[model samples]
Target: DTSLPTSHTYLGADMEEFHGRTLHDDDSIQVIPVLPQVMMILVPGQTLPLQLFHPQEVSMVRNLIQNDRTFAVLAYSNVQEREAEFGTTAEIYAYREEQDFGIEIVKVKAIGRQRFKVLDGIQQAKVQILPEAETLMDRIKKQLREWDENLDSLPSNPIDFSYWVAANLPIDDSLRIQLLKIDSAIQRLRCELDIMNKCTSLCCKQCQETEITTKNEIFSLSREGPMAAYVNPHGYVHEILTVYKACNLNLIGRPSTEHSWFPGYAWTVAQCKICASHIGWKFTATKKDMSPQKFWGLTRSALIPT
Candidate 1:
């Protein structure tokens, strides 16, 4: 396919609204349950899975499930709620509960819907669904697909894709919240492109570190693109990025397909060669025809853009 640089772009009326509470008028202010969590920012179009076990959280989950199954998810640092200026409306798509060890194991897949602004009141906030420029969005999409050829798995909507960028990009939570505040979709996507452009060099977050990999070597092993969230045996969620090659990585232990993200690949613990910290995993192909032989899936928690 060729780039549409000098050609016209078409946006159909079918792109009117997504499956959620549709707004008909300007600055549609409404009341929604504000659910603030420690170190969780739900971006629009990103599905956030939750495990509610504590009494308060379980009860809150019950309260939300009893209603329209929606809540405003805010990214808070402390044990208390700071009530941020911007947050995303999280809708519970699917959920289930299991009783375990005298605790209610409530599992919910909360997909983020709209970006809302805090009003003077606690529950009521104004939902300002971000604006989109299709021409710019198409251009940005082209830019991103160049990063990974399999980027066709992303959401088709321009505004949704912008949020996907805001969600998936390897940036700080503070920087991510700044993205949540931007009203224009093209501008937000432009900011994301700028950040993506700067991530040429990857470094270890730990002390006495070294460069891990460059952006040019990064590629998509999954439909989620180069960066994706993966869970470990101990319930810890890690945002990992896949790259074709890496430097200063000491592959730990023998290769195993145990809980392998890529079915045809075996993973070995990829550690920071200098600091000896757990960086991610080095995945090698199981078969001869497994395309590109080996790759690295580094953790964002232990990495920084240099």
Candidate 2:
């Protein structure tokens, strides 16, 4: 029961504080600035952990503890520019005071409770609540759960799924900022679904979407596009497309026995049969039972979108 301290700590928002409360466009909200410049993006219903060490932040921490413990955690761009046009509301759920590396610090556990539209300024900003309709949330949940069973636990009330998916998904900072700007949960979910759909397959430059390869066959560390940089023995950096499987390619010659970039990997040059272009190398794992017995390492510059 939430009658005890432990119970209340994890029990999310105090319903009485927010439920049935009408938030208008002109509502005034208290704003706080995060110093030393950190880029943190939070979504509603996702728990966040923070460490505050600066002396000025200590006072802020105390002030939050003494009050309702709510504030906007803005993502600061490296310079005068703001990283995102919108920000999320952070509710301090629990915290502790301690010393770390010879400095006083506060450990805060918080959650992104809602989205806000921000009006920018010098080192500070004002925000107003942006709430979405329920029908959109319902449709997104139904479609997403049907597409991926892991999303079955998505919260049914309002728009909690965005935060949960945002927390778990492997997305870029730019994409995160875009998600923050989107006012509709359904639109945000639609964008994410598009990315996920693209991850499962890829098309070649010559043939377009007609010819494709499933992600299950290709293996790489990231679902996002190929942006990994590597250096050859020549000391030149090359951005290569790393994938676990290959198709629609002509194996040029015998696998090289020596001078492999990846240890325990022997490579053979492969080319795109359709375009007669040097696509990438085919790497055969020396180790047994590797999920990808062999994978393709293509040049990112050579590949095109599906």
Candidate 3:
């Protein structure tokens, strides 16, 4: 665990006290409005590093520093009139003022403390506590075993374990929102297990191509390794593959997009020949330091999990 300096005024309540405390409907919480419609979903036990660029948000950070460093992170949505129905309570771990492009900004490192169902404006109408379910753990463990992984080292606390799985799993927004709504940790684990099982026999969503049979064949940021989930800047979790066996894919255009995450790799649009579905990208290493020379980064969304 990365420990922040204790000398600085510690924000939020003590972890022990926080865990013991119960939330009520009348509990007052600060709501953070992130601009440009960005929704970040974080579960308890997960830490997120955020850069507040908007002028209004910077002031909000300043206020948080002076007062109680706790707030609710609401997802901004254009479709919904109220934006989001749920959010997570965040405790400020550490923060610093910074300047970028001649504008004042603040950088915050925070951790998710509790999950809440936001009602009205900033009121937390209900607190979501993970219910006890014994078999849920065994099911998650079995699922990990099927993927050649183990969860023996994970936290014994079901709440923490559920959040850990949420942070790591390659789940979409809808699924993530569903997980958040579920009050039972066991139920969340079950839902994730079902998704993972479905992903194991994923097929192309476009033309129903069945070349990729197992999750093992999918690729990830880890080169030539088993498929894993990665969160993008947009907060969307995707299971990516560095190499795919799809023969119907047509690699188009030159490697143009300079992906920030993959330093030496440039990306090109790759589409399915059969259905012309935008599968993913063909990454070509522009520098000698980059491995794999060239590979395909297929998105799990392009495929229908069977």
Best by TM-score: 1
Q: What TM-score against the true fold does each predicted structure earn?
A: 0.75, 0.50, 0.59
- 10 residues in a row with least lDDT, candidate 2: 1-10
Cα shift from native, residue 35, model 2 (Å):
4.6
Q: After aligning candidate 1 to the native by TM-score, how far in Å is the CA of 118 from where it should be?
A: 3.5
- Lowest lDDT 10-residue stretch of candidate 3: 1-10
Best by lDDT: 1
Which tens-of-lDDT digit does each residue in 1-306 have in candidate 1?
112100101111121112445332346665676643424676776665555666777777677676667777765433255746667777776666667788776656566777776662234445554433677677767777776565646677767788778877767666788888788777887788777766667689885358888766766665545565554433345667788788998887999976565567788998887889999998888999866788888887788766
CA error at residue 258 for candidate 1, angstroms: 5.0
Which digits, one per residue and each the tens of the lDDT, describe model 2 over residues 249-298?
A: 78888887364545556788887777777667888867796545677777
Any runs in candidate 1 off by more than 4 Å, and if so which?
1-38, 76-83, 119-135, 255-266, 284-293
| lDDT for position 180 in model 3 | 76
Question: How well does model 2 score by local distance difference test?
Answer: 0.55
Kindly give the stretch of ten consecutive residues in candidate 1 with the minimal lDDT sum.
4-13
Candidate 1 residue pairs that clash: none
Instruction: Tell me the deviation in Å of residue 58 in model 1.
Output: 2.3
* Tens-digit per-residue lDDT, 1-306, candidate 3: 102211111222212212233232334443443333324666776555555667776776677666556666653333356467776767776677766589886656566666666651223323332222657867775675555442334566776667666665555556767777787777777787786666545567877765433555433343212333333444344455445444556888876743233555677878877777788777777778755677676776686654
